[PDB]
Amino acid sequence: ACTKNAIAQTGFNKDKYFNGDVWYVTDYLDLEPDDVPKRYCAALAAGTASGKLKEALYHYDPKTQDTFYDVSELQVESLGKYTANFKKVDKNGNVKVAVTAGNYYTFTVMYADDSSALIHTCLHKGNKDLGDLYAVLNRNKDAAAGDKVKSAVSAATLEFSKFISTKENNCAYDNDSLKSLLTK
Ligand code: HEM
Ligand SMILES: [N]
């Protein structure tokens, strides 16, 4: 179960974050550790499409090759805090698993600048028991976490040394699919 009410960044700039571009997960912290594999690739695009706030997600397990995309129209709880009812899609936006009640994630932007971000997410999916997941994002898939985002990790009373990097998984991403999924 999730346990954190993450606080959104003071002064969060929504239009800059939701600009239609891609964010890569470089490091993550799962509070229920073997909730998720130790090795993993994830990325997202976030933007407004025809007036609607959207995210597109990509997950890839580099060992099993398990791959999935999702798209969601995000609902606002407060500035920097969203609820996302997701639908599983192929890379072209064709629906594989439709939106349903109880399949949603929350999404809190704790820190962001033009290049980096720290988010909290709580996933709800059917009758699964899932915990809090923090992710360090960068616009550059190979970027080491810098001082702004690492300080934000500290300010959240987290230890960056506990985060797991995604950099040794040889992750390769279809940025075009993520951008185009925002419209779907
Ligand atoms: C970037 C932020 C992230 C968001 C918003 C997010 C969101 C989601 C969503 C919505 C699903 C369900 C998709 C579906 O069933 O269609 C999912 C599944 C999953 N995510 Fe993430 N995720 C993120 C990052 C990660 C990372 C970094 C890992 C790390 C290992 C991860 C591991 C998983 C796993 C293992 C599942 C499968 C859950 C299951 O069905 O048992 N996610 N995630
Ligand atoms: N996740």
Q: Give the up-direction half-sphere exposure of residue 39: CA atoms within 13 A in the CB hemisphere.
A: 10
**C-alpha pair distances (Å), 51 with each of 48, 54, 79, 126:** 6, 9, 17, 29
- Protein residue with its CA nearest to atom 1 in ligand 2: 123
Ligand nearest to the CA of 127: 1
CA-closest candidate to residue 120, choices 1, 34, 7: 7
Q: What is the CATH number of the domain that holds 150?
A: 2.40.128.20
The burial class, CB within 10 Å (0-12 / 13-18 / 19+), for 16 is: exposed
Q: Report resolution (Å) to 1 decimal.
A: 0.9
- Mapping DSSP onto H, E and C, the string for the chain reads CCCCCCCCCCCCCHHHHCEEEEEEEEEEEECCHHHCCCCCEEEEEEEEECCEEEEEEEEECCCCCCEEEEEEEEEEEECCEEEEEEEEECCCCCEEECCCCCEEEEEEEEEECCCEEEEEEEEEECCCCCCEEEEEEECCCCCCCCHHHHHHHHHCCCCHHHCEECHHHCCCCCHHHHHHHCCC
Calpha distance 149→154 (Å, rounded): 9
**Experimental technique used?**
X-ray
Q: Are 38 and 172 in contact (CB under 8 A)?
A: no
CA 59 – ligand 1 centroid, Å: 7
Protein residues with CB under 6 Å of any ligand 1 atom: 25, 28, 36-37, 40, 42, 44, 57, 59, 68, 70, 86, 88, 97, 105, 107, 121, 123, 125, 128, 133, 135
CA 45 – ligand 1 centroid, Å: 14
Q: Locate 41 and state its tokens.
A: 């690739």
Residue ranges of the binding site: 59
Question: Is 57 near ligand 2, meaning CB less than 6 Å away?
Answer: no
Domain count for the chain, please give it: 1
Question: Is 123 near ligand 2, meaning CB less than 6 Å away?
Answer: yes
CA 67 – ligand 2 centroid, Å: 13
Please report the sign of the dihedral spanned by the C-alpha atoms of residue 106, residue 100, residue 129, residue 47. negative
Range of the domain at 61: 1-184
Q: Locate 98 and state its tokens.
A: 């439709």
